[PDB]
Amino acid sequence: AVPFRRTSKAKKRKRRTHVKLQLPGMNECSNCGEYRLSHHVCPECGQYDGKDV
Amino acid sequence: MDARDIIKRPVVTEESTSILDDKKYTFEVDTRATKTQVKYAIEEIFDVKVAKVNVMNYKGKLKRMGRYAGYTNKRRKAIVTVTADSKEIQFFE
């Protein structure tokens, strides 16, 4: 329950190859003209489905 | 000792200014002075007629100005009430 040998740099980076985080799923609101999350209410023009809320 | 030695200076704050209207005057006195000595110091300096005297002992506050620690001077506050028929001490002109 304790490391026998210390971890090199190569093995550390090899393990960390999968610790990234993904890109957001966004596109551009037709009314706003700038980016927003799909299936979400855009915060600039305050509209969803072409209707203000 | 001398009357002007056991009376140091007036206290000018919001509380003292508030109570000046009630013929009460707040002063700063020596740390070795009893209230009788205070009553005789005043009335001899200001030529009034004192009714009662209350005294208060304050400790020093721990201050600091960077790596340096110390205490402010210990005080002794006194409140002197003159009688109804006496005059009034001016304080601020």
Partner: protein
């Protein structure tokens, strides 16, 4: 299989009663995702009970609504309570509509803990 919301059986029922009553009064509240998805069903069943309009239905609903004042009207000051609003205002609005008295709109993560917040309203 409904949904446990990180809290025990008695605590969960108390939470559902609070959110259901808050939605009747204000008609537009902002909560998390699962919490709104759960209060949706209870609010809609409660509105159906109001649609029935009976005295028995009124007692059934009163066994769930929290007893709090919506607002005071000058009839003489006489407050109106949540059950009165449910059976006099909210229920007649959807007399011609069968189901689906609520909608859910997504907002985005909360700052403090990244919780996905939504806004749920009764229209």
């Amino acid at each position: 299989g409904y949904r446990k919301l990180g809290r025990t059986s008695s605590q969960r029922k108390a939470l559902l009663r609070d959110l259901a009553t808050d939605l009747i009064v204000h008609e537009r509240i902002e909560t998390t995702e699962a919490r709104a998805k759960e209060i949706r069903k209870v609010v809609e069943k409660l509105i159906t009970s109001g649609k029935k309009g009976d005295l028995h239905a009124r007692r059934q609903a009163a066994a769930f609504i929290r007893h709090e004042v919506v607002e005071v009207v000058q009839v003489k000051n006489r407050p109106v309570y949540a059950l009165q609003k449910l059976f006099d205002d909210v229920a007649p609005r959807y007399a011609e509509r069968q189901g689906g008295y609520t909608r859910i709109l997504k907002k985005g993560p909360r700052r403090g803990d990244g919780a996905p917040m939504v806004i749920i309203e009764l229209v």
